[PDB]
Design an enzyme around this catalytic site. Structure first.
Site: not given
Ligand code: F43
Ligand SMILES: C[C@@H](OP(=O)(O)O)[C@H](NC(=O)CCCCCCS)C(=O)O
Ligand SMILES: [Cl-]
Ligand SMILES: [Cl-]
Ligand SMILES: [K+]
Ligand SMILES: [Mg+2]
Ligand SMILES: [Mg+2]
Ligand SMILES: [Mg+2]
Ligand SMILES: [Mg+2]
Ligand SMILES: [Mg+2]
Ligand SMILES: [Mg+2]
Ligand SMILES: [Mg+2]
Ligand SMILES: [Mg+2]
Ligand SMILES: [Mg+2]
Ligand SMILES: [Mg+2]
Ligand SMILES: [Mg+2]
Ligand SMILES: [Mg+2]
Ligand SMILES: [Mg+2]
Ligand SMILES: [Mg+2]
Ligand code: NA
Ligand code: NA
Ligand code: NA
Lengths: 442, 248, 548, 548, 111
Positions: C146, C332, C444, C480
């Site tokens: 991401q 112990y 005990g 224990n």
């Molecule tokens: C691989 C996944 C599927 C999954 O199960 N988790 C992922 C990825 C995971 C990873 C991404 C870390 C990395 O890049 O290596 C982490 C950080 C969790 C971790 N393993 O530590 C995370 N998401 Ni996700 N994830 C987030 C979010 C989101 C938003 C991002 C949308 C945008 O337009 O950028 C979308 C869902 C959506 O569309 O609503 C999303 C998807 C996804 N999320 C897609 C990857 C999207 C992509 O290919 O770009 N996350 C968020 O919306 C904001 C917070 C953010 C989290 C990190 C933090 O809180 O700082 C992170 C939370």
């Protein structure tokens, strides 16, 4: 008597079996076949004699990759299965002509065990089934081969695993459809902690039978949980009838009309038409080129919608012959039908919510898995009160081989043993027949 | 069917996307080979991989539901399940995430649709996916500036547009050509470079984006002004609330 | 030769060890002790700083009416006051537990099948190396997919990483060696062949999450944290869709189907998740300890290094803190790893057995139990009778019970080659000791002792289990001090005498054969000494993100 | 006046906040960022030292194709990159959790009855003071009865102590004030009188065990450690036999009958003992936060300080580590405590309510829910539409959903004075938002959302519960970011509007009114900023016992 | 209910108080609860008031356990029958009824 509703009951070929059966003849509280199924699932154990033998021969006991060098014991268990099973039966039974069953399968490699119902009548719960079965087979094996005091503890480890160091029977070579009482998400949840793959396995992937078994277990849990007490009882009974028992052939007929070319949306359109024709819903108000529907019977609307939800799953996942999209069907059938009608979706949004998290946890890194590993006790899929998991069972029954964690992978021992039991394999048949039998006693 | 309440252009566009009898406007021509390239699952000329044998080769027991439900062509063949995923700008892209999932399960058979804020996905059998994807790419579901085909690194739905009117893409899969005024897809949806780019046509102009969009905004049509649409949402809230309490 | 404990007794007391009488009450109480003096001074500073009274030597009874002893850490020449062996005061002990808590073992066998079968992509040493580069960036808490991710500070999480091992030498040798636990390098030839045959062509990850996270959170965090970053790394390294149906198969495999926890979760009265000390079975604890692969020509050394590992973890940290707390249970536990006392007794028993039967050649039966466990019990008790300084050293009956019975049980298992008869010998030792001195342990102490003989060979539901599978949650053992670590030693004993590469889980054995750990599991007692001397460097500190 | 987020938007971007267009791809990727640059260099050093690759900016996709933003910590003038708000990198955040985890509240009411009725000895303020001097020596891990005890280093455990409180002023004033949480000093007059009436003549201990212990062990350690040292101190201070039948009554009272845990234990799938984050109900979290007693004239400030407390604990540490891990969930949480965005929206709603109804004077019904939650939802969403910089800031739909609905739900509760209708407003906000933008959160965001309306007023077994009693283990809430901390805010909201001294447990409220805590619970957002700047001094470090 | 002391030791929610004459209407409440608890009229369900209506003995019908896995139907069926009977006796609103639930069964399911 308590409720005036009557339903027509059919077989899994869409043929009428019995007209105008009182709704409560299908109640878990009244229907003797549901009682028999539930007591059967409490009391039935699969014993893997081959697995016990191999664990002993290799000293691989106590869970994945575990082994104790020097502890190997080479016992001809499968070759002496008849004697061992008979000896175990003598310990498991209460009396010689009771309802204990011990039946060898697979040339003595497996045994079907049904622990006598009387043991459960004087038990708090259901763990007597694995515990009585386990010790009877441990003792029978020790006695068959005169295993010494010094070695017998390995037989115990091969049968029941790392218990009691582990809370679960970790590494055991017995299996049940139920799981241990400590793993319940809440009191009353035990009939919900039954893997979808186990249901599909027991019913040999017959879609309607899988849906029926799952609905029976889910809605029976709703009574144990108190959710189907008082104000909610009729809602749950109608849900059991229309979503899991194909009441009035509604699921069957929606699938027939939508199976060739249909979609989730076309099923919705047909269900709304049918609810309107049957007087379940009615136009309440006209907005601009939009009819707002109302109902004087929310429980019946919910049940019709639930039948359409099942049919939509059958049409959508049936057309793909791939189960994964059941999470999507459970979500968008409900989302679509609300904006199509102005009425609440199945379980008042709880199926849609279950589906949101189930979709996430079957397409993400965070947990879950494929559809078949969920169950009504899973944190992801516990939220709807019986109206979601039976659709997952139907979808997995319809899967042609797209799943890594398939019933063949997770549930083979369960399949071999539990599919032998007619009432487990074809529950729709037995529950409908029992309802017909008691119809004039309600 | 009704699909969606409301009296705005947005509401009508939401209904049109859902209605399988509404003919989606075709805006661009894309070759079969180029759809396959964009998807990135197999090479042109490569046989469809399989996840299981053809249904004909299997020996399944009698099941009335199976018998009544016609499998899609890729299910008959045993194709893998594969995906196409789109990101839609909040600056007036024609399609939007729930619009897509709702529409997909009205229009398409055998569909696993998922909605997120920044991405929307369909998974289905590969050969069927290719047919659906052509429609998703050629029609008004897609604008090549304000929508993106993205299987990863999807950030952009909520970002400011660049000076060409293009949505942000961390991986720059779609490139605006000032000389033609056209957008080219230079990478497939997972971000691997294409040997030859794919013409995606001109971006829609502002007037046409406004005609076609399904997002409500204060600088377009505001949701709060589509009072009939708001009324139905509020109704569903109230009826759900009452139902969970005492089934009245 | 001198008994092995004589040097330590001479260090503690002015009298020769045999002398029967001494003088008390003339040492100035706490003032005799460097460490108590440090504590008194610190308590005054703490109280003044925070405005609340704290450590005060005048509260309650006056410590040090007798000699406050130094302890020799066994197999070392390090002598320390016992306070330096308290887990709170010893960073080596804390890190030993963190290094176990923060480890999980996670197969790649389903993951690679998902890749080859569901996705239809290839897996090779080259792709595995690329995956390992990826997951070694991701695992400590850094991003791979991401945009606009915020990340852990690499220097705070320097202890987190992923290695692999496999029984397939060809694959092991072609993966970049930075990432490989090389079974052929770490184990002697016989053991390596055993271990490679157990693993076969399986490929397993050893995942260590950051100490700082483990300390902030709990043991049940470990497999989840592991799985999240495995999942991200599969997506990135194999160019997958970033969240499709198949993603859930990697999750289920990493979180459930192919994960080995160090400990299993506990029942509600002592509720804890996975990777807590109570869930670690005795056989795993023996396999975590790496003495077996270094000291394999000396089964006593191997067994007693396991006893040290377990006495500290199970009595000091687990029973003495997780399950109680306060001053706790340092001594112990120290009784089992100081002053070369258990060593003296256990070498005696090993020689008795070697001479009479040969190691592992005695009949596996009650006759052998009665012979060996009785003989070794009487030897150990005689030493307390012949050396008054020894009895004043191991002043608590429990300490003596544990030490004598550990020697008896280990010796019995050295004879039979079977841990269960070793366990029977442990309980017989207790019974004999109790009758000899008309005392045993604390109020005990012998709950499990008295259930013991009957439950050794039982086969009933919550009674019967081979010793290797038992642990701190075995019902009789759940409460224990002065048993659990010693049972881990008895579990090790027959395997050490047999030359076995592992006791209960070969994956666990291999997973700690790794010099990138913070704690050196090959030399547990040496590490406890280094921590006592305030010379051990733990992970997880926060100095980098706090003021100068 | 300007909307409250405008300053932050101007800091982040060169364009004005209303500008729709920008340019990307020209910032050098990670090289634009001081913090990423620090991380790159640190990864190189870590990899070189340990011989295993670690942080590497070239793995996966290239961060920073857009601006990598600073964040304003709301109510402060501190701007930091988001990495400085990651719990791993922020010692204030870690210590906030440690201070909760290591606390329990333990009555003296049964113990004093045991003393007077079973022992037949008197209890007075003087004897209580003597007991408190004793337990403040013992609690950190020091001895009061036995000879030859070895003890914790007082300076390692300086953060452990015991205070008391009582509603009886004259009794409180007679106990030595070093040990007393003075309710009249810490709370404004009307709140003090409420709290004193709740407590009455009851006397309660607030026990804090050492951070170093809590980090080594787990939350379920706390009540055990507490009880051991209470037990020893009862023996010493009241001159009891050191282990008689009555000793067990003190143990049962301190461990079970009069202990209040911060969190209750969790079910097996998410197995954890007591005093873990998932067990902390929302009403307790609101009561732990001490904003209520400082900022009482501003119910928005109080409510949003609770949101910050909970968003960090529940999303970053709990969901983002205990229940997952890796990079985690920093920005899912920061959205609720940065850039003054939630503050802008919630002040808008509070003013709307003030003007139309008066605080706490709206009918407690669905008409009010529809009115307020709709109005506030449309305001918040309008701001993202009016200010493209705001939308690019809170780029994830989940972040926006949580912020908008928190404002709507808190505002609804400001109007009704009832948290349950506040909760209904939260769900209505989600439904409206979803229809307005044809999106809401991440794939699984609205599981609870869609179950939400129906379960607000349900009375069924695992459905029905007042919001204050719900927590992270309420079934629908058990999995997903962007809700739990916001619910703690909604729980606080009607109570702040009413002027109530507490939300759910007066003992919990009083127990954190204590400047001897390491974290300052009166100013949670200020503390997060101090930690971000690497200016926070945590407890629990091992520097004293490791090399210089 | 009267004090809003629900959810465990020392817990209280200010503003949530409900003053219902439960003990004074115990006969009606118990009868209404019994109709929900029983399976059929004249089965082995017992609901008996004790202590002038301050307490009730409840024996949930044995048939519910014959089609149950375990024993939790006893507290769960009893709890919801009395929650519903109290709500219906006093026409407790949708907005307030969750307090009756908390007063009967406590902090479950958060605990
Ligand atoms: C691989 C996944 C599927 C999954 O199960 N988790 C992922 C990825 C995971 C990873 C991404 C870390 C990395 O890049 O290596 C982490 C950080 C969790 C971790 N393993 O530590 C995370 N998401 Ni996700 N994830 C987030 C979010 C989101 C938003 C991002 C949308 C945008 O337009 O950028 C979308 C869902 C959506 O569309 O609503 C999303 C998807 C996804 N999320 C897609 C990857 C999207 C992509 O290919 O770009 N996350 C968020 O919306 C904001 C917070 C953010 C989290 C990190 C933090 O809180 O700082 C992170 C939370
Ligand atoms: C679902 C369940 O995972 P399993 O399906 O049991 O593997 C559960 N995880 C979670 O709920 C993860 C929550 C935190 C990450 C997602 C936040 S939106 C758990 O690990 O016990
Ligand atoms: Cl009804
Ligand atoms: Cl004193
Ligand atoms: K910890
Ligand atoms: Mg029979
Ligand atoms: Mg015999
Ligand atoms: Mg009309
Ligand atoms: Mg064409
Ligand atoms: Mg000397
Ligand atoms: Mg190299
Ligand atoms: Mg399991
Ligand atoms: Mg080293
Ligand atoms: Mg203003
Ligand atoms: Mg600027
Ligand atoms: Mg390199
Ligand atoms: Mg003070
Ligand atoms: Mg209790
Ligand atoms: Mg301060
Ligand atoms: Na003293
Ligand atoms: Na890479
Ligand atoms: Na990168």
């Amino acid at each position: 008597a308590k409720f005036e509703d009557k339903v027509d009951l059919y077989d899994d070929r869409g043929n009428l079996v019995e007209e105008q059966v009182p709704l409560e003849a299908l109640s878990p509280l009244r229907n003797p076949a549901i009682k028999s199924i539930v007591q059967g699932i409490k009391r039935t154990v699969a014993v893997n004699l081959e697995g016990i033998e191999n664990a002993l021969k290799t000293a691989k006991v106590g869970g994945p990759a575990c082994k104790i060098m020097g502890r190997e014991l080479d016992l001809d268990i499968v070759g002496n299965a008849e004697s061992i099973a008979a000896a175990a039966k003598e310990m498991i039974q209460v009396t010689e002509d009771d309802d204990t069953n011990v039946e060898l399968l697979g040339g003595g490699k497996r045994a079907l065990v049904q622990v006598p119902s009387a043991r459960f009548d004087v038990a708090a719960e259901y763990s007597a089934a694995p515990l009585v079965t386990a010790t009877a087979f441990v003792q029978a094996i020790i006695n068959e081969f005169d295993v010494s005091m010094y070695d017998a503890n390995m037989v115990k480890a091969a049968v029941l695993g790392r218990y009691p160091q582990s809370v679960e029977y970790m590494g055991a070579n017995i299996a049940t459809m139920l799981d241990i009482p400590q793993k319940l998400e809440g009191p009353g949840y035990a009939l919900r902690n039954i893997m979808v793959n186990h249901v599909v396995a027991a019913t040999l992937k017959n879609t309607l039978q899988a849906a029926a078994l799952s609905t029976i277990l889910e809605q029976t849990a709703m009574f144990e949980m108190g959710d189907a007490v008082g104000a909610f009882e009729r809602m749950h009974l109608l849900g059991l009838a229309y979503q899991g028992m194909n009441a009035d052939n509604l699921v069957f007929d929606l699938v027939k009309a939508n199976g060739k070319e249909g979609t989730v949306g076309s099923v919705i359109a047909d269900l709304v038409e049918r609810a309107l024709e049957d007087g379940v819903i009615k136009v309440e108000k006209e907005l601009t080129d939009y009819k707002v529907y109302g109902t004087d019977d929310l429980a019946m609307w919910n049940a019709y919608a639930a039948a359409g939800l099942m049919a939509a799953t059958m049409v959508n996942q049936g057309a793909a012959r791939a189960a994964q999209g059941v999470s999507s069907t459970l979500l968008y059938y409900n989302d679509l039908i609300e904006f199509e009608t102005g009425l609440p979706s199945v379980d008042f949004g709880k199926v849609e919510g279950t589906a949101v998290g189930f979709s996430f946890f079957s397409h993400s890194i965070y947990g879950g898995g494929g559809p078949g590993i969920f169950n009504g006790n899973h944190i992801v899929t516990r939220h709807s009160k019986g109206f979601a998991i039976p659709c997952v069972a139907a979808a997995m029954a319809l899967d042609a081989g797209t799943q890594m964690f398939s019933p063949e992978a997770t549930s083979g021992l369960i399949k071999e043993v539990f599919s032998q039991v007619d009432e487990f394999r074809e529950p729709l048949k037995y529950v409908v027949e029992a309802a017909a039998e008691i119809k004039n006693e309600i | 069917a009704q699909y969606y309440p409301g009296t705005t252009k947005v509401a009508q566009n939401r209904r049109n996307f859902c209605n399988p009898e509404y003919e989606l406007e075709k805006l661009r021509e894309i070759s079969d080979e180029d759809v396959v390239k964009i998807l990135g699952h197999r090479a042109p000329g490569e046989e469809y991989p399989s996840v299981h044998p053809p249904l004909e080769e299997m020996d399944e027991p009698e099941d009335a539901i199976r018998e009544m439900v016609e499998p899609i062509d890729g299910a008959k063949a045993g194709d893998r399940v594969r995906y196409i995923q789109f990101t839609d700008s909040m600056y007036f892209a024609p399609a939007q995430p729930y619009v897509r999932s709702r529409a997909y399960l009205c229009r398409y058979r055998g569909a696993d649709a998922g909605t997120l804020s920044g991405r929307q996905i369909i998974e289905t059998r590969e050969r069927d996916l290719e047919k659906i994807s052509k429609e998703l790419l050629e029609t008004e579901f897609f604008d090549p500036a304000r929508s993106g085909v993205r299987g990863k690194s999807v950030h952009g739905h909520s970002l400011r547009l660049d000076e060409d009117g293009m949505m942000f893409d961390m991986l720059r899969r779609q490139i605006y050509n000032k000389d033609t005024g056209r957008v080219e897809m230079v990478k497939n949806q997972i971000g691997d470079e294409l040997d030859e780019p794919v013409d995606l046509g001109e971006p829609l102009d502002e007037e046409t984006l406004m005609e076609k969009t399904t997002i409500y905004r204060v600088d377009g049509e505001a949701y709060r002004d589509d009072v009939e649409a708001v009324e139905i949402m509020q109704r569903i809230h109230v009826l759900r609330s009452q139902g969970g309490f005492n089934l009245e | 030769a001198d008994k092995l404990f004589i040097n330590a007794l001479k260090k503690k007391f002015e009298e020769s060890p045999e002398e029967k009488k001494t003088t008390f009450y003339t040492l100035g109480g706490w003032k005799q002790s460097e460490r108590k003096t440090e504590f008194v001074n610190a308590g005054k500073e703490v109280a003044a700083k925070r405005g609340i009274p704290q450590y005060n030597p005048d509260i309650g009874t006056p410590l040090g009416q007798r000699v406050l002893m130094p302890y020799q850490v066994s197999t070392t020449d390090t002598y320390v006051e016992g306070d330096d062996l308290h887990f709170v005061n010893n960073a080596a002990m804390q890190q030993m537990w963190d290094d176990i808590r923060r480890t999980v073992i996670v197969g790649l066998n389903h993951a690679h099948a998902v890749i080859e079968k569901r996705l239809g992509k290839e897996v090779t040493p080259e792709t595995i190396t690329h995956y390992l580069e990826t997951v070694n960036h991701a695992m400590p808490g850094a991003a791979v997919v991401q945009e606009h991710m915020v990340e852990t500070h690499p220097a705070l999480v320097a202890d987190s990483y992923v290695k692999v091992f496999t029984g397939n030498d060809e694959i092991a040798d072609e993966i970049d060696p930075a990432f490989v636990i090389d079974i052929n390098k770490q184990f002697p030839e016989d053991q390596a062949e055993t271990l490679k045959a157990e693993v076969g062509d399986g490929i397993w990850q050893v995942v260590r999450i950051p100490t700082i996270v483990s300390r902030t959170c709990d043991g049940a965090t470990t497999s989840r944290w592991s799985a999240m970053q495995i999942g991200m790394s599969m997506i990135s390294a194999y160019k997958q869709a970033a969240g499709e149906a198949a993603t859930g198969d990697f999750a289920y495999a990493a979180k459930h189907a192919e994960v080995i926890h160090m400990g299993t979760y506990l029942p509600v009265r002592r509720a804890r998740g996975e990777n807590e000390p109570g869930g670690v079975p005795f056989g795993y604890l023996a396999d975590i300890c790496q003495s077996s692969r270094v000291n394999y020509e000396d089964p006593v050394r191997v067994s007693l290094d396991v006893v040290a590992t377990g006495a500290m973890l199970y009595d000091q940290i687990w029973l003495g803190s997780y399950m109680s707390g306060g001053v706790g249970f340092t001594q112990y536990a120290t009784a089992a790893y100081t002053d070369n006392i258990l060593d003296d007794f256990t070498y005696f028993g090993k020689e008795y057995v070697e001479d009479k039967y040969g190691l592992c050649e005695a009949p596996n039966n009650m006759d052998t139990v009665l012979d060996v466990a009785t003989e070794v019990t009487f030897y150990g008790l005689e030493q307390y009778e012949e050396y008054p300084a020894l009895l004043e050293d191991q002043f608590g009956g429990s300490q003596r019970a544990a030490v004598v019975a550990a020697a008896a049980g280990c010796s019995t298992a050295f004879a039979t080659g079977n841990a269960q008869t070793g366990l029977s010998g442990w309980y017989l030792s207790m019974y004999l000791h109790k009758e000899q001195h008309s005392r045993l342990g604390f109020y005990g102490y012998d709950l499990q002792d008295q259930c013991g003989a009957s439950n050794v060979f039982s086969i009933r539901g919550d009674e019967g289990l081979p010793l290797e599978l038992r642990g701190p949650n075995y019902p009789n053992y759940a409460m224990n001090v002065g048993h659990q670590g010693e049972y881990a030693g008895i579990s090790q004993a027959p395997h050490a005498a047999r030359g076995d590469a592992f006791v209960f889980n070969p994956l666990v054995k291999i997973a700690f054969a790794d010099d990138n750990l913070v704690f050196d599991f090959t030399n547990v007692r040496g590490e406890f000494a280094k921590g006592a001397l305030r010379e051990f460097e733990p992970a997880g500190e926060r100095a980098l993100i706090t003021p100068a």
